[PDB]
């Protein structure tokens, strides 16, 4: 980019002579109302922006400032990752080579290492009368606990 | 357009405190950046006395002047006002009414640098002390 | 700071290349202004950047220049252009120049 930025300040004014300075900040995972401003980024440091709320947005005056350092020899990039585990039927998974898909019909009754659509453990598969839902391809306990797939 | 028209004394004695009016005519007072006033004693070069944010209370003064000035707004006369403490035969000079636009108002946005240069002006005021 | 400009009394003739300059003690971030002021009268805006020309003034104007040095140049001189040429800075505190002065001859 041209030029490392990010916020300095956001603050609702409220109302009167514009004498309370109430600031206004974000919830984790969330964006600021600040950041359309200048969403690409901001020219100069201190910049002033003014915006008028409307009824539907708390009333007063938005004030927003923002801050401009200089660009780096080499881009340094900010990561902030998140994962989720036993919240979907499929998997994201890394390129590991776990093998081929194998069969259970010549294993069941004999408690084998499992990972199935993502989900890994060992148990021991038996045939059974099918329960549950179909397309939630598995069924688990009254404690998150596997009991079927 | 504004035009910034200012109202006070000419004659103030020493220890005395100034006070000046500037009412502006154009727009309003949040219609702008900041409001500022520029002193320049005969011919001895212009001065910065100071500034005030048109939203908010916060303002900025010359360090030179040992904390003697106090400028504020009142919206509702529409005008912002300057007082100037302990006044000197030093200090006497011609007080301008200043302004600091926005480099642009559009939709609900103003969008103005952290410093710019002053635009409208208005006639100044003439100010003496003696006895 | 302590702005600073050299031609201090540059009297000139009708039709010129007329060119002012103004120094800064330290170099500004093209924060620079020029502002022209008749006698008696409140002075008023020219340029409000390196050359960044104001609405309303005529086109014959044109300044250059960054950091630590820079100018103001005209070429016709015209009646109405004789007077007195300050330079503003905003880049560190606010300040104005010591004042040039031109006339005819």
């Known amino acids: 980019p041209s030029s490392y930025s990010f916020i300095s300040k956001c603050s609702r004014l409220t109302g009167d002579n514009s004498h309370i300075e109430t600031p206004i900040v974000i919830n984790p995972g969330e964006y600021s109302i600040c950041k359309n401003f200048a969403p690409n980024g901001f020219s100069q440091d201190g910049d002033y922006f003014t915006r008028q709320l409307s009824q539907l947005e708390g009333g007063g005056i938005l004030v927003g400032v923002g801050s401009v350092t200089p660009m780096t020899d080499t881009l340094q990039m900010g990561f902030i990752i998140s994962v989720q585990y036993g919240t979907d039927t499929n998997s994201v998974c890394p390129m590991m080579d776990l093998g081929n898909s194998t069969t259970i019909t010549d294993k069941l009754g004999v408690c084998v290492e499992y990972n199935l659509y993502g989900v890994s453990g060992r148990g021991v598969f038996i045939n059974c009368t099918a329960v549950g839902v179909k397309q939630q391809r598995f069924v688990y306990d009254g404690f998150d606990n596997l009991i079927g797939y | 357009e504004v035009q910034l028209l200012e109202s006070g004394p000419g004659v103030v004695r020493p220890s005395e405190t100034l006070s000046l009016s500037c009412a502006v005519s154009?727009?309003?007072?949040?219609?702008?950046?900041?409001w500022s006033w520029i002193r320049q004693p005969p011919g001895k070069g212009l001065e910065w006395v100071g500034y005030?944010?048109?939203?908010?209370?916060?303002?900025n003064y010359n360090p030179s002047l040992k904390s003697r000035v106090t400028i504020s707004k009142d919206t509702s006369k529409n005008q912002f006002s300057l007082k100037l403490s302990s006044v000197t035969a030093a200090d006497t000079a011609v007080y301008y009414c200043?302004?600091?636009?926005?480099?642009?108002?559009?939709?609900?946005?103003?969008?103005?640098?952290?410093?710019?240069?002053?635009?409208?002006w208005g006639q100044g005021v003439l100010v003496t002390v003696s006895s | 700071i302590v702005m600073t400009q050299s031609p201090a009394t540059l009297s000139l003739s009708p039709g010129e290349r007329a060119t002012l300059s103004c120094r800064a003690s330290?170099?500004?971030?093209?924060?620079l202004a020029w502002y022209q002021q008749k006698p008696g009268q409140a002075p008023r805006l020219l340029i409000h950047?390196?050359?960044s020309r104001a609405t309303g003034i005529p086109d014959r104007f044109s300044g250059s220049g960054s950091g630590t040095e820079f100018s103001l140049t005209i070429s016709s001189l015209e009646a109405e252009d004789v007077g007195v040429y300050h330079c503003?800075?905003?880049?560190?505190?606010?300040?104005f120049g010591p004042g040039t002065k031109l006339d005819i001859k």
């Open positions: 200043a302004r600091e636009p926005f480099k642009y108002c559009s939709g609900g946005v103003c969008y103005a640098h952290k410093d710019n240069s002053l635009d409208v």
């Open positions: 950047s390196a050359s």
């Open positions: 005030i944010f048109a939203t908010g209370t916060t303002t």
């Open positions: 503003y800075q905003h880049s560190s505190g606010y300040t």
């Open positions: 330290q170099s500004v971030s093209s924060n």
């Open positions: 154009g727009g309003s007072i949040s219609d702008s950046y900041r």
